Amino acid sequence: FYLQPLPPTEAAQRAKVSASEILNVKQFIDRKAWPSLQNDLRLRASYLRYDLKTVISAKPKDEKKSLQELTSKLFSSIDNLDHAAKIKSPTEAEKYYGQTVSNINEVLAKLG
Numbered sequence: 226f227y228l229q230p231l232p233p234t235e236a237a238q239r240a241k242v243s244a245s246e247i248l249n250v251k252q253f254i255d256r257k258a259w260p261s262l263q264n265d266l267r268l269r270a271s272y273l274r275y276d277l278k279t280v281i282s283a284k285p286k287d288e289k290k291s292l293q294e295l296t297s298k299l300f301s302s303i304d305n306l307d308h309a310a311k312i313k314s315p316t317e318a319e320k321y322y323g324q325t326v327s328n329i330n331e332v333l334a335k336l337g
């Protein structure tokens with residue numbers, strides 16, 4: 226993946242879109258198409274990572290830390306879902322997909 230950066234909340238709009246596309250990998254979990262789930266998750270993850278850092282930098286310092294922490298949890302669960310796909314476990318994939326959805330809602334709530 227190659228990315229072309231964007232400014233404050235042009236990037237939050239794109240982050241919200243990558244976040245939604247991430248919700249969409251459940252179908253890959255259901256068909257158990259692990260490599261597809263991983264490639265899609267990876268791309269979305271790369272966009273999301275870049276745009277959240279951007280949205281964070283242009284955030285009043287009083288709320289940078291808070292978003293940064295929700296952002297950090299999100300990428301931990303995203304990684305964990307990539308790991309679950311890597312080891313081909315419907316169990317773990319389902320668990321981390323769950324945690325990922327909850328972490329996305331948290332970041333979305335702080336967005337908009």
Ligand SMILES: [Zn+2]
Nearest residue numbers: 289290293294
């Ligand atoms: Zn910090």
